[PDB]
């Protein structure tokens, strides 16, 4: 742990978590991520995001 | 950026754009840059190109 001051570590973790929340609110609230599931899919209608 | 002339810092990004666009253009006029949708059915088009 030594090379980094005992503050950034916490900054690191909090930034990780805040970024993650941003990511997920982007994905489940997005006009694109919603996806056709079937490998051979003939325009189904049970699409959804994958996050 | 300190041990780095920003001239490099911009050369890199212009190179990024150049390689990306030229790569995609190469992809379009390519024989092998076409995958088949719904591979279980061979009778369709091959518009799937992955670029």
UniProtKB/Swiss-Prot annotation, chains A, B:
Entry superkingdom: Eukaryota
Subcellular location field: Cell membrane; Postsynaptic cell membrane
Tissue: Highest expression is found in the olfactory lobe, piriform cortex, dentate gyrus, hippocampus, granular cell layer of the cerebellum, and in caudate-putamen.
Transmembrane segments annotated in the record for this chain: 7-27
Maturation and modification: Sumoylation mediates kainate receptor-mediated endocytosis and regulates synaptic transmission. Sumoylation is enhanced by PIAS3 and desumoylated by SENP1. Ubiquitinated. Ubiquitination regulates the GRIK2 levels at the synapse by leading kainate receptor degradation through proteasome.
Its job: Ionotropic glutamate receptor that functions as a cation-permeable ligand-gated ion channel, gated by L-glutamate and the glutamatergic agonist kainic acid. L-glutamate acts as an excitatory neurotransmitter at many synapses in the central nervous system. Binding of the excitatory neurotransmitter L-glutamate induces a conformation change, leading to the opening of the cation channel, and thereby converts the chemical signal to an electrical impulse. The receptor then desensitizes rapidly and enters a transient inactive state, characterized by the presence of bound agonist. Independent of its ionotropic glutamate receptor activity, acts as a thermoreceptor conferring sensitivity to cold temperatures. Functions in dorsal root ganglion neurons.
Family of this protein: Belongs to the glutamate-gated ion channel (TC 1.A.10.1) family. GRIK2 subfamily.
Misc remark: The postsynaptic actions of Glu are mediated by a variety of receptors that are named according to their selective agonists. This receptor binds domoate > kainate > quisqualate > glutamate. It does not bind AMPA without coexpression with GRIK5.
Oligomer status and interactors: Homotetramer and heterotetramer with GRIK5. Tetramers may be formed by the dimerization of dimers. Assembles into a kainate-gated homomeric channel that does not bind AMPA. Can form functional heteromeric receptors with GRIK4 and GRIK5. Can form functional heteromeric receptors with GRIK3. Interacts with DLG4. Interacts with NETO2. Interacts (via C-terminus) with KLHL17 (via kelch repeats); the interaction targets GRIK2 for degradation via ubiquitin-proteasome pathway.
Protein name (record): Glutamate receptor ionotropic, kainate 2
Organism: Rattus norvegicus
Encoding gene, per UniProt annotation: Grik2
Full-protein interval shown: 556 to 606 of 908
């Amino acid at each position: 742990l030594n090379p980094l001051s005992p503050d950034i570590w916490m900054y690191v973790l909090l930034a990780c978590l805040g970024v993650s929340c941003v990511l997920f609110v982007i994905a489940r609230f997005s006009p694109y991520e919603w996806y056709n599931p079937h490998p051979c899919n003939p325009d189904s209608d049970v699409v959804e995001n994958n996050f």
